[PDB]
Design a protein around this ligand. Structure first.
Ligand SMILES: [Mg+2]
Ligand SMILES: [Mg+2]
Ligand SMILES: [Mg+2]
Ligand SMILES: [Mg+2]
Lengths: 201, 203, 203, 201, 203, 201, 203, 201
């Protein structure tokens, strides 16, 4: 089929992932765990010593770390430092599928000059992924400045009236006619999954 | 006591003769009066009743009276995202001028083509205050906010396609951009924005 | 710089003569232009002004210009749930073809009668991308998503009975289906979906 | 009357259920406890040793476990493993009322072939109960494929934009013209109650 | 394979001739067909096209075909809160009868005057199923639910004053009443309620 | 003026109420504390030994318990046992203001016969106060059966789709033409305050 | 049994002849009847049918019958925020008078110019009950509530600009003001407010 | 530039603020920390002993406390004592930027006479800042009584139907034609930032 396996680390218990990981990882393409608790990564180190963990990403993969299967790369960009978790969740997921990924972090619209410094890197990426929370303006900015496919991920980070990310989700929908397609809140996985399919062309 | 304010009438709540009954009752102070949000038909039956009255179709407002020079040399900037927001922006611009301010309009400056914003950034930054008006693309307030170090009044507009929610999303996004002096007002309320912007300009 | 894109005009924001003032001003590049979401009356007063223009009533769009061969041999699939979503789907299909793509339409493929989906599954799966369009029954994006291993752009539609919320529920359900490459766009935004789908098809 | 008794395990205190269970279970049809805390099942074992507990269902019944009062059975189907709690809450409630119930678990639309494998069992059930959370598509699928009464239960399980189950509740309402009638979020009890009445015909 | 169901057409999505093109194409099975939610003008241009067709203005539905005896001796009860819910209730009643059920209507049984409910409680309780229909006063489903030990399908209606939210509150209240067999359907969906109620009546 | 004093027990700290209670209760009409924590009632017993506490009401009054200043009484009615807290919050507040109050508890619409048993008491009360949460039908029922002023209080108690009491608030508004006026969620104080004014006529 | 209440008909739910069929059927008790929320056209076709009927255009209500003296000497106060709330307030005032109460109207008492409230505060405070009616500026209920020690029934109105949400925000703000006897009713429900206010006035 | 630096105390970790404070406070205008945890103010005292902390404001500034750079002052007014936190958050932020600020606290509409006692002070302030939560009526009152620029801040404080401050945000928007411009919930920083710009004219 070509796609690795993926589970639901937050939806399952501390060991149901490992009870089915051995029934699902019978020497096949590497495994992926999304939404894994920072504490539950320690309660499973003795069960799988050959496991790597990404604290910022809250994801863990046990197996092969593939190589670039395409000369083009995906660009993950984020406005503030508060969205770095869901950014790395998308980054390591786009890495498991076998796509080189370039990280462009802390590039909010409050400092728009920071984007034009890294615009040459963003424009030369087969797909780009915009991440935002409070006032998801970054999507509209990169959408009108980059004529390449963009995936938008809203984040639940923020305080009052952000509505746990709902008001960023509505922003990036309202600027979709610029080449932007948006997925669900905190769904860095679904963005990198779709971005991988577009990059694997 | 009056502190130098022109008179304002809500043109949508009154009938075609109730507003001319309040204009001719105020036609003695020599200070210009203003009427907001009145339809083109609400004025068409008035042109014979008020020969000394001028109407702005795009702004949907009417002002009648001798309008003297601006009270302050500073100018406020009315920034618009797309062509579909020209009504509300002109509603704010024509009412901002009536209170006695100079106003430099900066229209069609959406994020779709940000270079248009950097073209007129010098005019926007050198203004006492800036009023941002945007609809489906509520991002414009965030961009201008972080690029100007002067007060900003954001005004969402109801024009948009689906999920624009008659400008409700534009309201939330402008609210979540209160970083570098962003301040939002009600939906479509170009007047109240220019009301607050006139006091800041004439501090 | 232009990278090979046809021209697009928002037909709902302009008047009947403002769009023919922009068509004849662009009638020199020989590259076809497009106009989205213009009413049948907004075109009826134009047929004498543009003899070389064709209109799609179901799509509510107008394209004028010599349309050459497709730029890529791949084809995108426009999948529709019910007969009531034919407008938006055709809006996406006719604009997806203008950018220079082949498109194989797959209509009336609702979950009410899933066998109709398994009938044309071979055509849908062998396409470079797939655009799903659904209204009250937002489930179609979820089913096609888990059944095709190609990118999918979901487009909710406003048509529906009560609680459909002008397609708002269809938006939420398509958003909660981002498993196997599902990606949603704005309500009724068949154009923006096909805009993104054209770049993925011509990577 | 024919119906057993039922209480509100989460709405009452640790012993108000037992203070009224003896005033209400004076040797009558078996008793039922909905929404009972996993901890409070241990603080009441000494008070009623003849009590059975279902951890997955979070329900406990003290008395007779009846037999099938009708040759037909009710089918409880669920899309993912995250809805198994409210599924078993409905399953054991349909069992107390005296209806045989067939469980068809982990049958999401992401793997639609899993449903057609068990479709012969679902189609031959006097009533079926669909359970879903994220993108409640399963209801519409079974509704258009099974010409038998369907009850729909939305679940609060899920992350962003699921709105604690609200966005599944709206989905199954919008496909009611296919023989689907939907109840409240996490209300596995009300679904099995109605499904029992339909089965007891 | 068909299991004994009459044919149904969504009269709101089609044009005045598209539904008569589907009626005459089905005028060979001798099994009656049904059309829901078609306007009185959508039928007025049809009376010459279908002499063997009967229309129910209050129900906004049309049925054409030889309608035989009921399939089961049991009867379902259609309970209505106020006079303003007669349209949707009759939409459910006329479609519930077409599938081959007897139906005993119980109208104007609002909580404002609960004695009217206790008057016809004997008729309601002795029915195989009961369909409750209510608008601003969504409480009726809760009262009947706790008073009958038979399945109940609740149907909210969009009619109401402010805060009724086109029947959205009626939907929530009927949802929070799932105690004694209450089960809610979509807004105004009298058909789908009667569709489910026909299968329960003919178990 | 005639009205006792009232504070905000949940909005203030453990002793700001007592720091201002002595500046506000300089030998005047009795004092009232709304929304007081069950734990904070113990951290203040040494500061005011002449204080009475109502655990169910989560309110405490320090001073005179007045007598009926009017021969008529207010009736507080509640559908289920889960609304008894906010019911007693209204009951003891209507008692401080000097109105006799009759309690009619556990009278849901699921057992409508329980209401007609106590309808003779409800109908003879100058004001009545309906309390409800899940499916606030009780208000509409008593409103159409009692031609006397009714105050409606929605409660935050309930599970899914109750929206922390929001969906009961909308119900009792939609049946206001029957002599019903509704206040805020869990605002038993504001109901008894208004009911007192109507009774003190 | 009737306890002294006039008759009330929902004028919006019935047709132009159904309400005159209920008026002439009640034209024998000599007790006046009332009809709420009927349009000016719904009465224009009635003036010949009921010569002994009077209509209130601002209130959109019609009352027919010999109206005797007030039942109690106390008076209720109907307080209005702006000129745009005169319809609903008059709907409450004319129905409050029909039940047999004196009512002292206090109009145009918005927070924009609070001195107008302190001018007529003596009249408002000395009333048995007070009904507050406000739209976009829902603050008026909070101000009057803390300034009068008599029961208050708040009534939000649907009139407003953006974000007023057809008076939904006015409903929330009046709900969050339940401090000194504030009690809110449904949107635009001036009748139900006056229904409750008549029982409190005649305790 | 003229503006001091500001961080996000709640969005960062216990020391990321200090890891970048020394890279950002290389002997420049004073530093500002918004939304700082009451506990995290103690875990950083050994790292910066020359730091002052405002418990009510939940903000801490390390450096110069400037002097009035303009003879006019900003007025922060609040209705109840429950909004004093976000009030002091705005007060100390307007103080860092170099504006004298006058505090007018506990001035709700329930006691409107308290406002007219301090109205002479409010009217003589180049900018005023209204703070409110439950029934944000105070903004409309001061807006119609003060012909000077007003900034409105809604607070998340309150109970039922306040919707974590959402229903105050909608109130002050609906009275913007009186010279009122409103910012986000609990955003005392953004209000004082804008109020400073207006005062620095
Ligand atoms: Mg682009
Ligand atoms: Mg079916
Ligand atoms: Mg009554
Ligand atoms: Mg002012």
């Amino acid at each position: 089929n070509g796609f690795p396996e993926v589970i639901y680390g937050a939806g399952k218990t501390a060991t149901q992932i490992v009870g089915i990981v051995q029934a699902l990882s019978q020497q096949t393409l590497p495994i992926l765990t999304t939404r894994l608790s920072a504490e539950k990564f320690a309660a499973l180190q003795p069960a799988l010593p050959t496991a790597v963990y990404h604290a910022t990403a809250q994801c863990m993969t046990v197996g092969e770390q593939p190589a670039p299967k395409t000369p083009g790369y995906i660009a993950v960009v984020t406005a503030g430092t508060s969205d770095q978790p869901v950014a790395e969740e998308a980054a390591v997921t786009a890495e498991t599928f076998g796509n080189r990924v370039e990280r462009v972090y802390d590039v909010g619209v409050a400092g728009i000059h920071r984007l034009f410094a890294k615009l040459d890197v963003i424009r030369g990426a087969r797909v780009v992924i915009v991440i935002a929370g409070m006032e998801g303006a970054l999507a509209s900015v990169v959408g009108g400045l980059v004529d390449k496919p963009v995936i938008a991920v809203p984040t639940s980070v923020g305080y009052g009236t952000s509505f746990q990310g709902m008001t960023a989700l509505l922003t990036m929908l309202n600027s979709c006619a610029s080449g932007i397609t948006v997925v669900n809140i905190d769904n860095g996985f679904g963005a990198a999954y779709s971005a991988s399919m577009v990059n694997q062309m």
